[PDB]
Design a protein around this ligand. Structure first.
Ligand SMILES: [Ca+2]
Ligand SMILES: [Ca+2]
Length: 75
C-alpha cells in the first residue's frame, strides 16, 4: 500500500515537539490537543485506546519506544 519513507530519526526529534511541558513523556492529556488540533474530532474514549496500544509499561504515558511503535502503524 505505498511506502511512507521518512525514518525513525525524523520521528525521534518530533518527540520533544510533543512534550510541550516538563514531562519527558507523552500522556493522554497531551494527546487530546495534539489530535484535537486536526479535523478528526476525537473523544477521550478514542484517545484512551491510542494510549493502551502504546502504554507498554502501564505508565499512563507514551514514551519514545511505545510512541514510535504507534507512529509506524498510525490508526
Ligand atoms: Ca508532556
Ligand atoms: Ca508506557
Amino acid at each position: 500500500e505505498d511506502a511512507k519513507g521518512k525514518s525513525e530519526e525524523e520521528l525521534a526529534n518530533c518527540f520533544r515537539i510533543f512534550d510541550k511541558n516538563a514531562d519527558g513523556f507523552i500522556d493522554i492529556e497531551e494527546l487530546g490537543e495534539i489530535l484535537r488540533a486536526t479535523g478528526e474530532h476525537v473523544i477521550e474514549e478514542d484517545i484512551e485506546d491510542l494510549m493502551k496500544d502504546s502504554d507498554k509499561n502501564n505508565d499512563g504515558r507514551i514514551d519514545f519506544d511505545e510512541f514510535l511503535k504507534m507512529m509506524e502503524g498510525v490508526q
